[PDB]
Design a protein around this ligand. Structure first.
Ligand SMILES: [Ca+2]
Ligand SMILES: [Ca+2]
Ligand SMILES: [Ca+2]
Ligand SMILES: [Ca+2]
Ligand SMILES: [Zn+2]
Length: 316
C-alpha cells in the first residue's frame, strides 16, 4: 500500500496498551514503513490460506478483542527488527532489509506459530493450552530468528542440525525478551501457555529436564518423532547456552558465566560465519569456540567458559 505514515494505538493480547506504526490511505493499515522495506500484518480470518488481507482498520485505534493478536505480532516484529539492527548490525532477516510479514487468526483453535519459509503465521490457540501466540515476545522472536537462520547457516530441520536450529531460535528469542525488558526469564512461551496455570512454560533453558527434555548428551532422544526430536534435544544446547551466560555447576562441571551480551555475540558469529546446513552438535561446539577465539582471544576466559559449558552437557 502507498500512503502516509502515522501512529495508532491499541491493546495487546495480555491487555497492555502500546503504539504501533500504521499507514494511512482511506483506511489505516498495519504497515510500518519505518523499518527496512516494511513490516506488514495480515488477517487470515480463521482460514489456512495465506497470507490473508493486509490488516485495515477504520480509525487507527485497535482495542477490539479480535485486534489483540495483530497488534502484538506487528509490534513485536518491530522490536525484534530493532534488536537485530541495533545489536548485531543486521538489516532484517536477510541482511538487506526484506519486508517482514505475519498473519494472525490462522485457522481455528490452532495451538502453534511458525515461519513458513516466507512469512510468520500465528494461531489463536484453543484457549486452554494457549492464548494467541503472538502475545509472547519470545515466541515472535523465536519465529523471526528461523528466517535469519534460513538466510545464513541454513540448518536442515531434522536430527542434530534441526535441534541446533531450534536452540538458536530459543536463545535469540530469549535475548530479545531481555532486550525489551519485558519481565525476562530463561523460559520459553510463558506468557501465552496455559492461561489456567501460573508458573509453567513450554520449555526451560535453565532446566530443561523440568519438562522432561534432556539436559545432557547422554540423554538425547534418538528416535523419529518431532523430526528426530528437534524440539527435545534442543534442550542440551539451550542448557549449554544458559551456562555460558549465567554460569553454574552442572553434572559436576563448573562454568563461570560471561553474560548475555557476549553469549549473543558468540552465537550470532557462529551462526553467520561458521555453521552450515548439516552441522551437528559437535560442530556447533567447534564453531562456538572459534567464534569466542575470534572475538576475545584464545586464552580468554570467554573461550574457557564456552568449553566448560559444552563439556558440562556432554558435547565433545
Ligand atoms: Ca479500530
Ligand atoms: Ca518472560
Ligand atoms: Ca520467556
Ligand atoms: Ca501457564
Ligand atoms: Zn522453532
Amino acid at each position: 500500500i502507498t500512503g502516509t505514515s502515522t501512529v495508532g494505538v491499541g491493546r495487546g493480547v495480555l491487555g497492555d496498551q502500546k503504539n504501533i506504526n500504521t499507514t494511512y490511505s482511506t483506511y489505516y493499515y498495519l504497515q510500518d514503513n519505518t523499518r527496512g522495506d516494511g513490516i506488514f500484518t495480515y488477517d487470515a480470518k480463521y482460514r489456512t490460506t495465506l497470507p490473508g488481507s493486509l490488516w485495515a482498520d477504520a480509525d487507527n485505534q485497535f482495542f477490539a478483542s479480535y485486534d489483540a493478536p495483530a497488534v502484538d505480532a506487528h509490534y513485536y516484529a518491530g522490536v525484534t527488527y530493532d534488536y537485530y539492527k541495533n545489536v548485531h548490525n543486521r538489516l532484517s532477516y536477510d541482511g538487506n532489509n526484506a519486508a517482514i510479514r505475519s498473519s494472525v487468526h490462522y485457522s481455528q483453535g490452532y495451538n502453534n506459530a511458525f515461519w513458513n519459509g516466507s512469512e510468520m503465521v500465528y494461531g489463536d490457540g484453543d484457549g486452554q493450552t494457549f492464548i494467541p501466540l503472538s502475545g509472547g515476545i519470545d515466541v515472535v522472536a523465536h519465529e523471526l530468528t528461523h528466517a535469519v537462520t534460513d538466510y545464513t547457516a541454513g540448518l536442515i530441520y531434522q536430527n542434530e542440525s534441526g535441534a541446533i536450529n531450534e536452540a538458536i531460535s530459543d536463545i535469540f528469542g530469549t535475548l530479545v525478551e531481555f532486550y525489551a525488558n519485558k519481565n525476562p526469564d530463561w523460559e520459553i512461551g510463558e506468557d501465552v501457555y496455559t492461561p489456567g496455570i501460573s508458573g509453567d512454560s513450554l520449555r526451560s533453558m535453565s532446566d530443561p529436564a523440568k519438562y522432561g527434555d534432556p539436559d545432557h548428551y547422554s540423554k538425547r532422544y534418538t528416535g523419529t518423532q518431532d523430526n528426530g526430536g528437534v524440539h527435545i534435544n534442543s534442550g542440551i544446547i539451550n542448557k549449554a547456552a544458559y551456562l555460558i551466560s549465567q554460569g553454574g555447576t552442572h553434572y559436576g562441571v563448573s562454568v563461570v558465566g560471561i553474560g548475555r551480551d557476549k553469549l549473543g555475540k558468540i552465537f550470532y558469529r557462529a551462526l553467520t560465519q561458521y555453521l552450515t546446513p548439516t552441522s551437528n552438535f559437535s560442530q556447533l561446539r567447534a564453531a562456538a569456540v572459534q567464534s569466542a577465539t575470534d572475538l576475545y582471544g584464545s586464552t580468554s576466559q570467554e573461550v574457557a567458559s564456552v568449553k566448560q559449558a559444552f563439556d558440562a552437557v556432554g558435547v565433545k
